[PDB]
Scaffold this active site. Sequence first.
Site, PDB file in Angstrom:
ATOM      1  N   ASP B   1       0.654  -1.216   0.090  1.00 45.21           N
ATOM      2  CA  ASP B   1      -0.106  -0.003  -0.027  1.00 45.21           C
ATOM      3  C   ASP B   1       0.784   1.448  -0.073  1.00 45.21           C
ATOM      4  N   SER B  26       2.189   6.964   0.865  1.00 41.75           N
ATOM      5  CA  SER B  26       1.479   5.631   1.420  1.00 41.75           C
ATOM      6  C   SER B  26      -0.077   6.024   0.756  1.00 41.75           C
ATOM      7  N   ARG B  27      -0.645   5.186   0.309  1.00 37.67           N
ATOM      8  CA  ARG B  27      -1.772   5.179  -0.511  1.00 37.67           C
ATOM      9  C   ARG B  27      -3.192   5.272   0.269  1.00 37.67           C
ATOM     10  N   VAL B  28      -3.081   4.641   1.487  1.00 35.08           N
ATOM     11  CA  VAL B  28      -4.064   5.114   2.525  1.00 35.08           C
ATOM     12  C   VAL B  28      -4.003   6.649   3.232  1.00 35.08           C
TER      13      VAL B  28
END
Lengths: 154, 186, 117, 57, 49, 232, 114, 114
Positions: B1, B26-28
């Site tokens: 992620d 960070s893709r969150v």
Amino acid sequence: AINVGVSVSRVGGAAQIKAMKEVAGSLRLDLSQYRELEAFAAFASDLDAASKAQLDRGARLVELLKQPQYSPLAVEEQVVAIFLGTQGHLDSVPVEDVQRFESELLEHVKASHSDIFDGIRETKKLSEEAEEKLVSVINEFKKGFQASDGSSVV
Amino acid sequence: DGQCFLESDLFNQGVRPAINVGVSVSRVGGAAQIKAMKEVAGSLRLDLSQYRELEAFAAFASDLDAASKAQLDRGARLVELLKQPQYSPLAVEEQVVAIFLGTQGHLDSVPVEDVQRFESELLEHVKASHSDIFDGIRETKKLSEEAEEKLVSVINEFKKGFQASDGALDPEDLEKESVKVRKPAP
Amino acid sequence: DLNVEIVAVERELWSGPATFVFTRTTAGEIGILPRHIPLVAQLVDDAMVRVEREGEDDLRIAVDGGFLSVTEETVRILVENAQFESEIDADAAKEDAASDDERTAAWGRARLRALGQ
Amino acid sequence: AEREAMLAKTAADNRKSAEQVAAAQADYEKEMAEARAQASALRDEARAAGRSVVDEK
Amino acid sequence: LADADAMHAKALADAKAESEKVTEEAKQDSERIAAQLSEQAGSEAERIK
Amino acid sequence: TLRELRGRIRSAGSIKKITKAQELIATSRIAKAQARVEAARPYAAEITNMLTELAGASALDHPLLVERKQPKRAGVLVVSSDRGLCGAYNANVLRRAEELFSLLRDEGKDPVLYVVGRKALGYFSFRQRTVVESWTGFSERPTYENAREIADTLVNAFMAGLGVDELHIVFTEFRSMLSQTAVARRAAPMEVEYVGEYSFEPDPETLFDALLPRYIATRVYAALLEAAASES
Amino acid sequence: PAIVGDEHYRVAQEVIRILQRYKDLQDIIAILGIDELSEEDKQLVNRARRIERFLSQNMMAAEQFTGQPGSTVPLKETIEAFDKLTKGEFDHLPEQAFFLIGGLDDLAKKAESL
Amino acid sequence: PAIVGDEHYRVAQEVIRILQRYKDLQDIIAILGIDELSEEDKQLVNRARRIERFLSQNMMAAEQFTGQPGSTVPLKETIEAFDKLTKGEFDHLPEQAFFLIGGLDDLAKKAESL
């Protein structure tokens, strides 16, 4: 997007009508000298006049070679297009107006003076009578044209 | 992620831990942070990736725009603020206040050489005199407007009490200009 | 006959034969002829030189503060800036003469003297 | 006073002659180039109208 | 001065003639363009039908 | 990986075009600058002939020919390029300038510094010394209207004795296309050199006192033209 | 230009021409510096660096990446804004004003924020 | 020099040097014109133009078109011809005297024709 600096044909002139050899024979040399000169465009005031004219020519030939898709030109119209650049009649037109000047002249001649095109097609040769008629009609068209900055081109 | 791309030619030049801020992500993102940290740090990756692009561009410029100079100086504060020695973890209540200084611009006046001392000496000052700012942020996960106004008052009180670290030719080879005189020497 | 050189700090501005030459120095107006005594003089700030050029001709020259030198061999005029009346910026000089800066007005009046007025 | 007036009048007549030659050729050019612009505009309006006939048909 | 003013009057008359000649020529040119575009419009209708 | 090397080859193949173009341009501009030096030379040769012939009749007592009783503070002009890419030019100038400041401080004087050109102004703003005045935007093509302002400022700073006790210039002499050097020389006070053997208007003392500032303006001009030919 | 109309096609081809000339110049600018270029090239680089950033947008799904809410820019407003940019009518704005911003009303409001 | 005579090697190194100088100078000629040269190197270009021409030969393959026979120069003549030519003993002849010429006694026959 033809890379005219690296593309080649091993057949060459044997595939061209005499009227096209008579015009295009210097075009590759002019574009090679322009491709060498290209970096001096930032400094054209200081460049010697005998090559400043080759820079102003080469920039007009690179415009003259552009073409919109699905509009192929008949041989009798492209020989008159390459003539405008190579005989230097185009040298007084600003660069941004060149394709409009080519497309307007070819429409003008195709109306008023189709006998230039008929003579080219039927003899395969740009005879001195057709050339003297064409240059007279280029000057007569220039007087009826205007640039995108509003200036005259004569 | 997401990536924490640790690059050796950032590690060598004192940016430790050596996160390449262009490639790292960070893709969150800010869905995985407490509210205070989303308010304070919310654009910081994009601001630093822009600074590194500007810094690569302006490396040989002799002069800059006023906004370009402001960004190039803010970026150098943020990079000095983000440096950290091994085995020195910070609690989230100390990380919110540390990033608050850089994002609201309170570090702008401090000379870049001393950003690390100013950070470290403020964090231990706030921990001695004004520990209710940490108890607030930790118990409620938010910088309340009253805690922001109090924190800015403590930063301005501290800044006045701070102390910045503010820093063969030969006479026979030298030549003389002359005036000649066509008469002999008196 | 005279041999005359007008020399500007940037260029050897003029060189050729003459018969007579008129100019206005800080000690007074003067004019010289081929056998003239050796001399070194300074021109006034609003000075002009008129050359009576050989073969029935003339020159009128505005001169920004030059020095004039003479010897039996050659006449040399050393000049900071100069302008011929055959190229004078006549429309401007009437306004240049009105300026508050002393040398700018003087250079204006020098060009007006090269314009015969 | 009339001799002095003939010298002023010869200068003013000469200056105004030169100014009128310059203005005469310029005034022709202003009208002619404006007509050149209107000729290009009239041509382009017929070109765009013929294009609108193609599009509608 | 009388010659220069006579050339000013002549120049305004020649401008009136030259502009009238050019705007007439543009009226013939504009028709030629419109006729060719209508021939192209009719040929598109023939081709699609 | 191959893509990085194909990128670096594309990059270097563009740089080679741009630097070969500016070698050819600089090869023309040194011919324009030498033409301007050789065109400016005839004036300075005649002003020198006139100044020596006036000095022969003068008392030789002008301020620019007399030393101070106890000098403390010396003026220096450094000249330098307004562009980059020059190579050693600005370094050779600024190493000579520092070698001169370490001569002056070794006699016991301190320098006050005047600067021509944006490059030396950048150097003496990284090293923490002041600059008294500076001029920029003409080192590529000097005109006498600039040399006038430089000479007036320097001569008005000497004649004030804030003020200075001496004047120096640091610049490069173009000797030939393959060879040149930074040179430092004292412009004021001037040395008088007696050697083995006219009307003046209104007097020789008056002309000599009005001529020396104009000689100083032509000498600083000749140095600026040597600096611009040498830069190219 | 037969499908999108010529106004769109001109602007799209001009924006690509500028960004292509900029990508060609990056290797010069990284070594010799922007101060070395022709006036037309230096003007083009200042347009390109603004165009690159004006092609960025605050997407709705990027709420967790940027904190700011998302925006939708109409096709006509997109064309008018890039037409103005390529002709330099925003060259007086700071470079950071165009980044993530959305449309012209937002661009003005961020240029007033600076 | 071990395999071909010392004179042949000397003349080949001289011809290569003269053409290498002209090849370096062609950029200055094309950009600034022959008037931008000094007098020492313009005398070298006056020889290099003529050496570059004198390498040309009326080869036998051209007899199909020109109708004149092709030449076959002895080695011992061509080393003399380039030795004399590099020292400048033919600079007063125009470039048209050296095109398609063949041997040295033929250069004498074309020079008296022109």
